[PDB]
């Protein structure tokens, strides 16, 4: 296993062997707990994965094919493995590796190859915020992942919206993230406005999981006194009426969050 992994790492250096090596290493993230430090400390390996990513920046008119996207998605999954490991995550952030993903979170291209990239890139960020570590939250606050998530939340696929909402939610759930978002009215109202637009869209194309994450964001915003006061005036009607009765029929948790939200607002 370790033997194969070191071979595949070497085989990233030859174009003829590179793709197979990427795919095989990616397959080992399920079963090799020490894969991330092996990747991180093997000379050139992180750079090879970043080169995979950088190599398709010129593909963003959008010319990315599904073959190119699947290759890079495997590199990203390897980076996610590094992001998720406690021995490599801090160094991962210190090297600013998430920034290499932001072009894939930024592009508005609707092609399926960019959707695979977008989802996998969101997966890396989501793996970071899943830790709820202050270091992660604060890193993301200074690198402006928030407007990237907001743009996806408004216009992405239902699944991209869900992951991007999950990322913003984890930031809101942190006290520093909530205080940062509520520090200026413009930050808060950008978040509130985008959430309001998703609520309207959800009334037309319902998704129980996306609604759940949107509601959680609202509920957390209502912990902040200034956000509470704005939501007292601007909370979307759809969160208090029968709009989502059918979607909520079995979601005891969201209904309970919605009731808690309204109560907070008095």
């Amino acid at each position: 296993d370790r033997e194969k992994i070191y071979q595949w790492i070497n085989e990233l250096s030859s174009p003829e062997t590179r793709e197979n090596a990427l795919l095989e290493l990616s397959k080992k993230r399920e079963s090799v707990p020490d894969l991330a430090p092996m990747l991180w400390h093997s000379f050139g390996t992180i750079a090879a994965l970043l080169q995979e990513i950088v190599n398709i920046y010129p593909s963003i008119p959008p010319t990315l094919t599904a073959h190119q996207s699947n290759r890079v998605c495997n590199a990203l999954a390897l980076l996610q493995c590094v992001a998720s490991h406690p021995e490599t995550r801090s160094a991962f952030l210190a090297a600013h590796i998430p920034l290499f993903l932001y072009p894939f979170l930024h592009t508005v291209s609707k092609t399926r190859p960019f959707e695979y990239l977008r989802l996998t890139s969101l997966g890396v960020i989501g793996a970071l915020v899943k830790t709820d570590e202050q270091e992660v939250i604060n890193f993301l606050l200074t690198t402006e992942i928030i407007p990237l998530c907001l743009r996806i939340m408004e216009s992405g696929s239902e699944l991209s919206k869900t992951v991007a909402t999950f990322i913003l939610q984890k930031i809101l759930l942190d006290d520093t993230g909530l205080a940062y978002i509520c520090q200026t009215y413009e930050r808060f109202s950008h978040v509130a406005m985008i959430l309001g637009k998703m609520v309207l869209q959800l009334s037309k194309e319902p998704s129980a999981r996306l609604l759940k994450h949107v509601v959680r964001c609202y509920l957390r915003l209502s912990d902040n006194p200034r956000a509470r006061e704005a939501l007292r005036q601007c909370l979307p009607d759809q969160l208090k009426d029968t709009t989502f009765a059918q979607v909520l029929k079995d979601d005891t948790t969201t209904k309970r969050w919605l009731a808690q939200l309204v109560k907070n607002l008095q």
């Binding site: 399926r112 190859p113 793996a127 699944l159």
Partner: peptide, 24 residues
């Protein structure tokens, strides 16, 4: 555009597998 070849199926499966790690 609804065409999918193997790389589409592989990349989408990979993406979903990555996201299933987040318990969404």
């Amino acid at each position: 555009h609804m065409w999918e070849t193997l790389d589409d199926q592989r990349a989408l499966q990979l993406a979903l597998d990555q996201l299933s790690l987040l318990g969404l």
